[PDB]
Each structure stands twice: as C-alpha cells, then as structure tokens.
Amino acid sequence: TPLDPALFRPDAISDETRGINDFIIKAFEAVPEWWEIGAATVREARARGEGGFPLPPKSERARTIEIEGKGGHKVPLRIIAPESPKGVYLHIHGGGWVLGACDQQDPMLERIAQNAGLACVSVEYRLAPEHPYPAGPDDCEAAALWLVKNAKKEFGTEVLTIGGESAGGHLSAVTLLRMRDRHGYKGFKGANLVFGAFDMSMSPSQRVFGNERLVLRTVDIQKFGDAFLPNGEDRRDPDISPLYANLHDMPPALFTVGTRDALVDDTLFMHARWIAAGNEAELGVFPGGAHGFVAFPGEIARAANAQADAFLRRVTGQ
Amino acid sequence: TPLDPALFRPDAISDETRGINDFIIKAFEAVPEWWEIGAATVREARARGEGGFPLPPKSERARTIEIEGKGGHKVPLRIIAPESPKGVYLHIHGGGWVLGACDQQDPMLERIAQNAGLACVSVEYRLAPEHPYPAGPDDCEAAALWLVKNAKKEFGTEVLTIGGESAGGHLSAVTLLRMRDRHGYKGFKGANLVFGAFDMSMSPSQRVFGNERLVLRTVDIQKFGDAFLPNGEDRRDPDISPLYANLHDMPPALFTVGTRDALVDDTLFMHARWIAAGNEAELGVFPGGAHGFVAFPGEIARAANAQADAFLRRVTGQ
C-alpha cells in the first residue's frame, strides 16, 4: 500500500530532497507577494522570466487555437502533439486560480507526448482576481466539451484523459464532474491529479502547514482562495470543493503528492473518496516532496513523473 | 489491500448482509425519535433492547467501581477481568454522546477478555444534552489517568489499550490526545477505533447519507452534534474533532468500518492522517456493513470482531 507510515518519517527523506527544499525556501524569502503589488504585475513579470522559478523553455512545435467561451470571449488552447496520437491529454495548469499560463510547462507536455504518445492540449483559462469563480471552471468545461466534440476530427482519436497540478488538479476534478452532471459524458479514460486542491474550506494539513515558504504556505492558500471566491460562496459546495461531490462514474485516477505539502490531506482524502465511490485509483507518495516538487531536479521528481507517464500509457491501452 | 474499490461496489455485498440491513431498517423505524419523546425515554428503551439494537446479556463476572471525576461527581467503571490479565482494554461505549451505557455490551467485553486475555474496563461517562461537552471527554480522561496510576495494583500489569464504537471511537481518540498533551503519557499499546466519528463539522459522507434509517442517518448526526455542542463551540477545534489534531506519537490503531456507514469518510480520513503522522494503522473495510454492524449476527460482524481480537493480541505481545 502507498500508505506506508515509514514514507512520512524524517529518515525516509533523502539528503538530495532536503537540500533542494532548503534552497527553495531561502530563494523566495524576498519574492514579493502578488496581493501586495498586484496580480497582473506579477503575471507579466513571470511571463518575461523575471522572478519566481525558472520559466521552462517553450517547444517549437506548439500551436495555438481559440474556441468560443461562455459570454463570447475566446479561450486559447495550446497543442503539442505527436504525428499519430494514441489519445489526448487535456492539461490544466496550476497557479492558485490567479497565476500561470498554458505555455509555461512545455517540457512536461513534450514528455507526455513522447512517453505516452498523447496529443497534449493545455487550457488558457481566465484567472482571478479579475475573473473569479466560476470563470476558470467555465473555460475548462468549454475546453472539455470542445474536445469531446472535435477530438476525432482534430487528432484522429477519441481516447481522452485529463490532468493538472494544484489548482489545475482542482479544475480537472471540477471539469470531470461537470461533464458527467451537465452533459452526461463519462468517457474520460483517466485523471492525472498532481497535488490537487480539493477542499476549499481547508483540510487539516492546510490549516497547520504554517508560513515557512516551501512553495505554498497556509497564507498563500488563504489569499488564492479569497481571490477565486470573493463573493461569500459556500466553500463546501460540490462545484467549488470536489471533495464534497458524489464521485460515481469517475475514471481511474493517479494521485501524486509529497509528504511536505500543505495539501497532503487533500490528496489522501480525495483518494479515499474516489475508491469509496467504487472507482479505480493509484496513489504515489514521495518522501519530503514539497508542493510543486515534480518541477524540480532530483530523484523524487523523476520517479513521480515516470509514474504519471506509466499511468497515462495504461489507461490509453498501452 | 483493504482500500480496494471492489469492496464498495454493490456486488460485493452478500445476500446475508442485505437481509440483515433490511431487518435493521425496519427495527429502527419502529423507535420514536429521542428529540420527540425524550433522551431519558429512549435510554430506557435502548436498555430493554427496544431501541433498534438487540438486548445484550449481562456477564456474571462484572463488577463496578467508582472513581473521582472532575468536579466531585463519581464516574462508574465496569470491570470484566480474567484471573491473570495480559493487559487492560479501556472501553468507551457509543451512542452519539447522548445514549448508551457501560453495561450494554458485556458480550463484547467477554469476547476480548477470553480471546485476548485482557481485563476490560468500560467507562460510564456523563451524557448530553444534560452534560454536554466537555463532560464526556472529562470523564474518559479521568478514567485513563486512574488506569495508568492503578493498573499494576488492580490488574497486575501496566500494558494498556483503548477502544470504542462510534462516539466511543471519537472519545478514545480525544482521550489519547489529552493523555499525551496534558499528562505526557504515550504508553498505550493500541487503539481499537470501531467506526468512529472524528469530524464534528461533518465529513462529506455524513452530509449526503440521507435519512433512510440504516442505524445512523444524517439527521441523527445533526441532532447528536447539537446536543453535545450547544454553546457555539468551534467544531474544528482539535479537542472536539480529533481529525484536526496533530497526531504525532500515537499508538498503533485498528480502524473498522462498513461500506454503508454515514461515517465511512471519518474512518478513511482518520486512517490517512494517522499514517501521515508516522503511526502504524490497520484498516478493515466490510462490504455492505451498516453503522454499528458488529452488533448484528452474520459473517461480516464475526470477521470484524475477529480482526479486533487479533489486533489486541498483537499489540499486547501475544
């Protein structure tokens, strides 16, 4: 069982992981906070490669299309695809519903296209605080509906998967439930849910992680959530917190999390409810992993990304 | 692996278990609501085997003592003990903090005394709504302190375990945390947590179970909680909801639950956090089991009780 308590004890963490985490904490002791200087200001700087983590290099083979969003705006979709796709991976980026972009993780999309043979489609959904809930989910639902309708003609295949990191793992679960409830679609083959947020009312580990700046502090969660949900929304509503939804008829899922993530309980709890609803689920727990650990160098990141590639192969008939 | 989705699907439930559950619903439907005829009235009904559960015959070996409680009242303890005990089982009965008694489960105490060789001590704690929080926990804490101090003299051993059902599983966890935090005691060998309640803010499964009267309905959980917590208490406080506490340095635990229990998420979530804190935990999931299923005949009850007996033997060195 992936729920081995030894994985959660200090001696399970490698010296490599400890060192990576220490550098990350010390690096961001001065990175200004977006709620102090402005979300758009932080966004523009990050897109230029200023501040924050390194900006991953973009792929030359990426192409962009636009689809119609609810209310008449355009929702861009970024496509990185092999010659003869074996399926599609609908990817939703993270960033607390406030930051990030569809073009800030091309190496990961290239990895999945190469190692699982999938056409990758990453969604440029609207961001808070400018566009709070339900704008983000509305755009991800529009992308999933577009893919259900157009995947065969665009990619030659109707084998679909979904996934994303942190807020993107949240939005992946919200989208799966909306496709089932609003459209009667239950045909996704798998969900790659990478340290997702599933309880917007704050699970136990979120509340006590504290404010040591290992990627995601308790205060970060609070500020992101307030930007996404500024209007007195019920934070246990199932469209806001998928942990509270009825999870019947969901696809097989892979849940990935590190043991030093404020969102550890979100993954463990969502994994439990996914199984309790009769769905297949795989769990990968990585000792010492920070929130966001899959983007860093080192062994636990490599192993977690390899587990994701193997899962995506398995659910797409490979 | 106990966390197998197949156990949660309808075809895993045996005909025997389905027939048991049908009778159980009809038996509970014949009982008036305690908030409509009085808690005292239902306590009396429950004591005559007319409150849904069967009448449990009392043991001839049982003896009762009284210890000093916080504030001067007396807390009765019911003792069923073999001649040369291998340890002690501190037992805390269930009943939604409102119902039940120390003398309504003698067959279970006799089973543990005989099969695990433990002296059993069952706590007669004060009940809501007349004595709301923290009266019940205060009495369980007093019992545990008395047992640590007096176990060697009374029973010839200092090997201790703790356990209980439903609200009794809640109180067992509350007691373990108080003993660690206030009293420095980390000596319990094991915790037998039988379908416990651990989140008084109501976990997802509690909210959606509904009001078909398979032992414990959503409405029952709501009414029990309000009687126990009538003074505006924060229901995510860690002394009220152990799911929110820091779980370091806890004993090995056995978590038992049936798949048709409103409290299924409480067990799965508490199990997850128990392991995530670096503690040993064992999980038993029983297909089709109602809340309270161990009290009713049939294979799954026998199997679950056998798993508890084996756990208690293991943690006491046998």
XYZ file of C-alpha atoms in Angstrom:
636
model
C 0.000 0.000 0.000
C 1.221 3.524 -0.788
C 0.003 4.420 2.726
C 3.156 3.246 4.456
C 3.865 5.370 7.561
C 7.597 4.960 7.001
C 7.285 7.253 3.965
C 6.150 10.049 6.293
C 9.001 9.772 8.812
C 12.072 12.035 8.634
C 14.560 9.277 7.834
C 12.733 8.498 4.565
C 13.776 11.861 3.082
C 16.992 11.825 1.078
C 19.759 14.351 1.586
C 19.157 15.442 -2.023
C 15.499 16.281 -1.368
C 16.325 18.096 1.879
C 18.879 20.253 0.066
C 16.525 21.104 -2.808
C 13.822 22.143 -0.331
C 16.247 24.280 1.669
C 17.376 26.234 -1.398
C 13.778 26.846 -2.469
C 12.813 28.267 0.927
C 15.825 30.603 1.090
C 15.382 31.738 -2.525
C 11.817 33.015 -2.050
C 12.392 34.853 1.245
C 12.198 38.097 -0.776
C 9.896 37.364 -3.744
C 7.156 39.991 -3.269
C 3.590 38.848 -2.759
C 1.113 39.293 -5.584
C -1.574 40.563 -3.210
C 0.776 43.400 -2.241
C 1.995 44.556 -5.663
C -0.768 43.370 -7.999
C -1.700 40.111 -9.700
C -1.263 41.475 -13.232
C 2.132 42.945 -12.348
C 3.337 39.569 -11.047
C 1.838 37.750 -14.046
C 3.575 39.945 -16.612
C 6.928 39.655 -14.840
C 6.663 35.857 -14.663
C 5.814 35.609 -18.365
C 9.004 37.558 -19.113
C 11.001 35.129 -16.980
C 11.502 37.668 -14.175
C 11.187 36.426 -10.609
C 9.719 33.145 -9.432
C 11.011 29.777 -10.528
C 12.756 29.377 -13.889
C 10.458 29.656 -16.885
C 10.563 26.322 -18.774
C 11.604 26.683 -22.421
C 8.815 26.675 -24.984
C 8.586 23.989 -27.657
C 8.933 24.925 -31.318
C 6.157 22.501 -32.303
C 3.489 24.139 -30.122
C 0.486 25.609 -31.934
C -2.434 27.618 -30.578
C -6.132 27.646 -31.425
C -9.040 29.524 -29.877
C -12.513 28.271 -29.002
C -15.673 30.123 -28.001
C -16.151 30.746 -24.284
C -19.294 31.393 -22.254
C -20.265 35.013 -22.880
C -18.344 35.437 -26.125
C -14.677 35.654 -25.146
C -12.100 33.337 -26.728
C -10.388 30.542 -24.764
C -6.911 29.718 -26.160
C -5.753 26.088 -26.284
C -2.056 25.209 -26.691
C -1.396 21.987 -28.620
C 1.748 19.837 -28.629
C 1.066 16.597 -30.464
C 2.942 13.641 -31.971
C 2.395 12.561 -35.561
C -0.128 9.760 -34.833
C -1.605 10.376 -31.366
C -2.743 7.403 -29.287
C -5.037 9.671 -27.267
C -5.408 13.202 -25.950
C -4.281 14.728 -22.636
C -6.325 17.762 -21.620
C -3.969 19.646 -19.302
C -4.908 22.424 -16.860
C -2.090 24.487 -15.331
C -1.783 25.480 -11.687
C -1.112 28.806 -10.020
C -3.776 29.268 -7.352
C -6.502 30.226 -9.863
C -4.577 33.539 -10.168
C -1.193 32.885 -11.825
C 0.279 30.691 -14.569
C -0.405 30.175 -18.257
C -0.934 27.482 -20.877
C 2.612 27.999 -22.234
C 4.654 27.764 -19.010
C 5.120 23.967 -18.921
C 6.067 22.852 -22.448
C 8.736 20.335 -21.289
C 6.090 18.420 -19.333
C 3.733 18.392 -22.324
C 6.603 17.221 -24.545
C 7.384 14.472 -22.022
C 3.826 13.131 -22.156
C 3.612 13.412 -25.952
C 6.882 11.475 -26.262
C 6.498 8.937 -23.432
C 2.745 8.251 -23.674
C 2.151 9.243 -27.304
C -0.688 11.629 -26.438
C -1.683 14.896 -28.064
C -1.494 17.470 -25.275
C -3.986 20.360 -25.106
C -3.281 22.902 -22.338
C -6.092 25.330 -21.440
C -5.598 29.089 -21.087
C -8.459 29.635 -18.644
C -9.408 33.034 -17.220
C -7.694 33.990 -13.970
C -8.744 35.637 -10.721
C -8.982 38.185 -9.166
C -10.095 39.749 -12.486
C -12.229 36.696 -13.382
C -13.247 34.884 -10.178
C -15.289 31.697 -9.847
C -16.930 30.362 -11.998
C -14.869 31.827 -14.901
C -11.985 29.354 -14.598
C -14.206 26.267 -14.375
C -16.432 27.603 -17.188
C -13.432 27.794 -19.524
C -12.149 24.332 -18.576
C -15.630 22.891 -19.192
C -15.753 24.623 -22.589
C -12.389 23.046 -23.463
C -13.501 19.557 -22.402
C -16.770 19.843 -24.344
C -14.878 21.077 -27.409
C -12.545 18.070 -27.153
C -15.417 15.571 -26.798
C -16.970 17.052 -29.954
C -13.828 17.585 -32.031
C -11.071 15.178 -30.929
C -11.737 12.622 -33.668
C -11.537 15.195 -36.446
C -8.625 17.150 -34.923
C -6.412 14.319 -33.625
C -7.797 11.127 -35.181
C -8.708 9.656 -31.786
C -11.448 9.934 -29.152
C -9.383 8.423 -26.320
C -9.319 11.281 -23.783
C -7.509 11.893 -20.485
C -7.329 14.922 -18.179
C -4.879 16.214 -15.601
C -3.161 19.122 -13.926
C -1.212 20.399 -10.938
C -2.517 22.067 -7.750
C -5.302 24.468 -8.837
C -5.133 22.577 -12.141
C -5.830 19.313 -10.353
C -8.744 21.024 -8.638
C -10.062 22.215 -12.008
C -9.581 18.744 -13.545
C -11.854 17.196 -10.917
C -14.409 20.036 -11.233
C -14.410 19.515 -15.029
C -14.891 15.735 -14.791
C -17.909 16.254 -12.542
C -19.400 18.968 -14.764
C -19.000 16.789 -17.872
C -20.887 13.978 -16.114
C -23.605 16.133 -14.486
C -24.232 18.831 -17.114
C -23.560 16.827 -20.280
C -23.887 13.114 -19.469
C -20.302 12.473 -20.610
C -18.403 9.841 -18.584
C -15.885 8.742 -21.198
C -12.527 10.036 -19.929
C -10.057 7.149 -19.569
C -8.007 8.621 -16.717
C -7.293 11.616 -14.494
C -3.714 12.638 -13.577
C -4.318 14.613 -10.361
C -0.989 16.111 -9.249
C -1.102 17.529 -5.680
C -4.544 18.964 -6.292
C -6.613 21.164 -4.024
C -9.986 19.512 -3.373
C -11.327 21.152 -0.182
C -11.666 24.941 -0.396
C -12.829 25.031 3.229
C -9.245 23.956 4.133
C -8.381 20.391 5.165
C -6.441 19.725 8.390
C -2.975 19.748 6.811
C -3.711 23.035 5.004
C -4.547 24.773 8.275
C -1.378 23.781 10.155
C 1.317 23.825 7.480
C 2.378 27.315 8.511
C 4.209 30.065 6.696
C 7.699 28.703 6.110
C 7.958 29.498 2.419
C 8.369 25.993 0.989
C 6.450 26.825 -2.204
C 2.945 27.026 -0.701
C 2.198 28.446 2.761
C -1.071 28.455 4.657
C -1.281 32.206 3.933
C -0.856 31.542 0.187
C -3.800 29.132 0.212
C -5.911 31.717 2.043
C -5.080 34.534 -0.387
C -5.553 32.416 -3.528
C -8.897 31.144 -2.271
C -10.119 34.637 -1.424
C -9.224 35.844 -4.933
C -11.028 32.896 -6.565
C -14.042 33.014 -4.184
C -14.610 36.672 -3.215
C -18.428 36.694 -3.044
C -19.406 34.699 0.050
C -19.632 31.389 -1.821
C -20.263 28.231 0.222
C -16.816 26.679 0.240
C -18.214 23.161 0.755
C -20.404 23.370 -2.370
C -19.517 20.365 -4.576
C -18.782 22.511 -7.661
C -16.305 24.555 -5.584
C -14.882 21.704 -3.450
C -14.945 18.421 -5.410
C -14.150 16.546 -2.181
C -17.859 17.070 -1.311
C -19.277 15.839 -4.627
C -20.795 12.439 -5.343
C -17.993 10.656 -7.220
C -19.899 7.927 -9.079
C -18.832 7.043 -12.624
C -15.377 8.691 -12.416
C -12.382 7.441 -14.415
C -9.286 5.784 -12.953
C -7.107 8.396 -11.262
C -3.477 8.798 -10.239
C -2.961 10.970 -7.155
C 0.604 12.284 -6.638
C 1.763 14.173 -3.537
C 4.879 14.901 -1.472
C 4.905 14.493 2.296
C 5.953 18.124 2.903
C 2.968 19.639 1.059
C 0.276 21.643 2.857
C -2.196 19.845 0.548
C -1.214 16.330 1.658
C -4.620 15.712 3.249
C -6.430 16.879 0.095
C -4.766 14.100 -1.903
C -5.194 11.440 0.794
C -8.858 12.355 1.378
C -9.765 12.649 -2.313
C -8.006 9.318 -2.983
C -10.079 7.705 -0.210
C -13.400 9.052 -1.522
C -12.516 8.118 -5.098
C -12.109 4.480 -4.014
C -15.099 4.596 -1.663
C -17.255 5.526 -4.677
C -16.111 2.359 -6.469
C -13.586 3.960 -8.839
C -10.026 2.838 -9.511
C -7.271 4.976 -8.019
C -3.489 4.825 -7.754
C -1.502 6.726 -5.120
C 2.088 7.919 -5.251
C 3.525 9.445 -2.062
C 7.012 10.920 -2.251
C 9.033 11.403 0.960
C 9.977 15.018 1.602
C 8.328 16.320 -1.562
C 7.278 19.952 -1.482
C 4.209 21.317 -3.163
C 5.234 21.572 -6.811
C 8.065 19.046 -6.398
C 7.625 17.455 -9.858
C 9.082 20.586 -11.485
C 12.399 20.427 -9.584
C 15.540 18.390 -10.274
C 16.266 15.206 -8.362
C 15.115 11.643 -7.892
C 11.624 12.030 -6.401
C 10.586 14.360 -9.230
C 11.892 11.891 -11.824
C 10.086 8.965 -10.200
C 6.776 10.836 -9.861
C 6.860 11.958 -13.489
C 7.687 8.389 -14.570
C 4.691 7.113 -12.586
C 2.461 9.643 -14.375
C 3.761 8.562 -17.798
C 3.136 4.879 -16.984
C -0.393 5.639 -15.746
C -1.257 7.577 -18.904
C 0.026 4.705 -21.044
C -2.008 2.180 -19.065
C -5.368 3.985 -19.269
C -4.927 4.639 -23.016
C -4.458 0.972 -23.901
C -0.667 0.847 -23.818
C -5.218 -4.157 0.243
C -8.166 -3.025 2.379
C -8.665 0.101 0.220
C -9.966 -1.865 -2.767
C -12.783 -0.170 -4.725
C -14.393 -3.548 -5.406
C -15.365 -3.733 -1.723
C -17.514 -0.610 -2.214
C -19.499 -1.851 -5.227
C -22.936 -3.474 -4.869
C -21.888 -6.954 -6.000
C -19.515 -7.328 -3.021
C -22.435 -7.304 -0.562
C -23.633 -10.790 0.355
C -27.282 -11.828 0.431
C -26.910 -12.381 4.183
C -25.735 -8.804 4.737
C -28.506 -7.378 2.538
C -31.124 -9.281 4.517
C -29.622 -8.106 7.802
C -29.743 -4.474 6.666
C -33.384 -4.778 5.564
C -34.390 -6.027 9.022
C -32.273 -3.340 10.696
C -34.063 -0.538 8.857
C -37.461 -1.884 9.908
C -36.289 -2.347 13.501
C -35.093 1.254 13.802
C -38.184 2.597 12.028
C -40.203 1.270 14.986
C -38.391 3.535 17.507
C -39.576 7.109 18.223
C -37.052 9.932 17.950
C -35.277 10.848 21.174
C -35.851 14.548 20.416
C -39.597 13.844 20.246
C -40.105 11.619 23.335
C -37.033 12.463 25.424
C -33.462 11.210 25.699
C -34.230 9.564 29.050
C -37.149 7.690 27.477
C -35.036 6.283 24.638
C -32.175 5.430 27.007
C -34.654 3.210 28.848
C -35.897 1.701 25.576
C -32.320 1.030 24.458
C -31.668 -0.669 27.818
C -34.544 -3.106 27.172
C -33.407 -3.952 23.639
C -36.198 -1.825 22.144
C -34.087 0.938 20.595
C -33.024 -0.755 17.379
C -30.128 -2.863 18.764
C -30.595 -6.322 20.324
C -30.582 -6.816 24.082
C -27.067 -7.866 25.192
C -26.993 -10.310 28.125
C -25.026 -9.165 31.155
C -21.962 -11.025 32.414
C -21.968 -12.650 35.847
C -18.269 -11.753 36.252
C -18.833 -7.993 36.028
C -18.007 -5.727 38.966
C -18.475 -1.972 39.280
C -16.295 0.630 40.979
C -16.479 4.418 41.090
C -13.646 6.930 40.711
C -13.483 10.656 41.415
C -14.451 12.856 38.480
C -13.576 16.461 37.732
C -15.867 18.476 39.997
C -16.614 15.818 42.614
C -19.094 13.538 40.866
C -18.401 9.803 40.680
C -17.565 8.084 37.380
C -18.554 4.388 37.380
C -16.261 1.845 35.718
C -17.458 -1.650 34.776
C -14.756 -4.327 35.074
C -14.675 -7.789 33.477
C -11.287 -9.379 34.012
C -9.571 -12.759 33.650
C -7.611 -14.171 36.567
C -4.139 -13.214 35.231
C -4.604 -10.389 32.706
C -2.198 -9.868 29.801
C -3.164 -6.193 29.793
C -6.132 -3.849 30.071
C -8.685 -2.701 27.482
C -10.159 0.709 28.353
C -13.505 0.645 26.530
C -15.751 3.625 25.752
C -19.311 2.967 24.576
C -21.073 4.714 21.705
C -24.474 6.331 21.384
C -23.973 9.781 19.885
C -22.760 11.253 23.211
C -26.459 11.104 24.285
C -27.305 7.378 24.644
C -25.731 4.105 25.792
C -24.153 2.809 28.984
C -21.145 0.947 30.339
C -23.211 -2.239 30.839
C -24.844 -2.616 27.384
C -22.059 -4.568 25.624
C -20.935 -7.262 28.065
C -20.697 -9.937 25.317
C -18.064 -7.847 23.545
C -16.138 -7.326 26.780
C -16.297 -11.068 27.483
C -15.040 -11.798 23.955
C -11.949 -9.626 24.456
C -11.312 -10.910 27.979
C -11.481 -14.507 26.736
C -9.820 -14.181 23.315
C -7.156 -11.561 24.105
C -6.782 -12.180 27.849
C -7.315 -8.519 28.744
C -9.069 -7.040 31.752
C -11.847 -4.865 30.325
C -12.804 -1.530 31.919
C -15.827 0.236 30.392
C -16.435 3.895 31.243
C -19.827 5.226 32.370
C -19.347 8.775 31.134
C -21.841 11.608 31.528
C -24.275 12.118 28.654
C -25.676 15.026 26.675
C -27.863 17.007 26.378
C -27.822 17.260 30.196
C -23.999 17.155 30.361
C -22.654 18.496 27.042
C -19.011 18.862 26.043
C -16.573 18.651 27.758
C -18.268 16.412 30.370
C -17.952 13.160 28.421
C -14.289 13.678 27.494
C -13.530 14.829 31.055
C -14.823 11.514 32.422
C -12.893 9.438 29.878
C -9.702 11.354 30.707
C -10.230 10.748 34.433
C -10.680 7.041 33.711
C -7.467 6.888 31.694
C -5.437 8.719 34.365
C -6.814 6.394 37.039
C -5.904 3.376 34.909
C -2.301 4.486 34.320
C -1.863 5.109 38.059
C -3.636 1.990 39.327
C -3.357 -0.705 36.629
C -0.459 -2.524 38.304
C -2.229 -2.719 41.667
C -5.661 -3.618 40.263
C -4.682 -5.938 37.402
C -1.003 -6.849 37.861
C 0.013 -5.260 34.552
C 0.726 -1.823 33.072
C 0.042 -2.955 29.480
C -2.875 -0.797 28.315
C -5.069 -0.468 25.220
C -8.088 1.717 24.414
C -11.085 1.455 22.096
C -14.723 2.158 21.418
C -17.515 2.357 18.858
C -18.981 5.412 17.117
C -18.964 8.286 19.668
C -16.819 5.905 21.745
C -14.230 5.860 18.982
C -14.345 9.662 18.984
C -13.815 9.717 22.756
C -10.972 7.179 22.547
C -9.078 9.478 20.162
C -9.833 12.566 22.279
C -8.541 10.706 25.362
C -5.310 9.548 23.683
C -4.539 13.125 22.647
C -5.306 14.586 26.091
C -3.159 11.930 27.786
C -0.234 12.843 25.511
C -0.698 16.631 25.615
C -1.607 17.286 29.255
C -0.135 14.279 31.041
C 2.903 13.250 28.983
C 1.564 9.708 28.611
C 2.426 7.943 25.339
C 2.222 4.392 26.661
C -0.932 2.889 25.151
C -0.108 -0.182 23.068
C -3.029 0.105 20.647
C -6.295 1.825 19.784
C -9.322 -0.138 18.524
C -11.304 2.541 16.668
C -14.598 0.984 15.527
C -16.457 3.234 13.022
C -15.586 6.353 14.997
C -16.733 9.923 14.492
C -13.706 12.186 14.054
C -15.009 15.324 12.277
C -17.754 17.188 14.147
C -18.040 19.684 11.279
C -19.439 16.743 9.234
C -17.305 14.974 6.624
C -18.637 14.525 3.058
C -20.213 11.096 3.604
C -22.027 12.332 6.733
C -23.718 15.134 4.804
C -25.086 13.025 1.928
C -26.001 9.722 3.608
C -29.638 10.795 3.899
C -32.427 9.707 6.182
C -33.087 6.056 5.333
C -32.849 4.669 8.852
C -29.994 2.193 8.455
C -28.922 2.732 12.085
C -27.487 6.265 11.680
C -28.996 8.974 9.436
C -27.739 12.435 8.526
C -30.471 13.822 10.815
C -29.194 11.697 13.728
C -25.677 13.084 13.279
C -27.056 16.633 13.264
C -29.148 16.128 16.413
C -26.374 14.316 18.308
C -23.877 17.053 17.461
C -26.149 19.869 18.634
C -26.794 18.126 21.961
C -23.072 17.566 22.563
C -22.038 21.047 21.338
C -24.752 23.594 22.266
C -22.620 26.639 23.220
C -21.281 27.893 19.880
C -18.056 25.872 20.080
C -15.723 25.782 17.067
C -16.413 22.303 15.707
C -12.985 22.119 14.049
C -11.178 22.596 17.368
C -8.775 19.638 17.779
C -10.178 18.603 21.183
C -13.659 18.438 19.624
C -12.711 16.985 16.211
C -9.619 14.758 16.546
C -9.305 14.724 12.764
C -7.856 18.255 13.110
C -5.310 17.453 15.830
C -1.587 16.845 15.423
C -1.362 13.043 15.616
C 2.328 12.558 16.451
C 3.332 9.762 18.863
C 0.047 7.847 18.720
C -0.198 4.078 19.286
C -0.885 1.562 16.514
C -4.563 1.700 15.575
C -7.139 -0.599 14.008
C -9.869 1.216 12.058
C -13.030 -0.816 11.300
C -15.871 0.388 9.064
C -18.674 -0.889 6.845
C -19.262 0.490 3.351
C -22.872 1.569 4.080
C -21.986 3.790 7.061
C -22.553 7.561 7.081
C -19.182 7.754 8.891
C -17.143 5.964 6.185
C -15.173 9.142 5.386
C -14.371 9.678 9.072
C -12.644 6.291 9.216
C -10.845 6.644 5.879
C -9.741 10.209 6.634
C -8.583 9.489 10.199
C -6.731 6.378 8.972
C -4.976 8.510 6.342
C -3.922 11.158 8.883
C -2.842 8.510 11.402
C -0.388 7.111 8.849
C 0.638 10.548 7.570
C 1.736 11.380 11.139
C 4.088 8.377 11.028
C 1.966 5.996 13.135
C 1.055 2.378 12.414
C -2.530 1.739 11.328
C -4.551 -1.244 10.150
C -7.798 -0.902 8.223
C -10.749 -3.262 7.989
C -13.471 -2.446 5.443
C -16.551 -4.653 5.339
C -18.796 -4.762 2.229
C -22.337 -3.635 2.941
C -21.732 -3.016 6.630
C -24.088 -0.604 8.347
C -23.031 1.725 11.098
C -22.926 -0.484 14.175
C -22.741 -3.641 12.056
C -20.569 -5.509 14.588
C -23.591 -5.741 16.912
C -25.618 -7.879 14.494
C -25.204 -11.556 13.543
C -23.586 -12.621 10.296
C -20.252 -13.236 8.643
C -19.000 -9.648 8.375
C -19.631 -8.963 12.070
C -17.795 -12.163 13.041
C -14.905 -11.297 10.724
C -14.594 -7.726 12.023
C -14.707 -8.823 15.673
C -12.065 -11.463 14.918
C -9.832 -8.771 13.385
C -10.141 -6.677 16.561
C -9.291 -9.666 18.789
C -6.197 -10.404 16.696
C -5.109 -6.756 16.808
C -5.411 -6.597 20.596
C -3.399 -9.808 20.968
C -0.703 -8.460 18.628
C -0.195 -5.126 20.408
C -0.082 -6.833 23.834
C 2.821 -9.061 22.767
C 0.811 -12.217 22.053
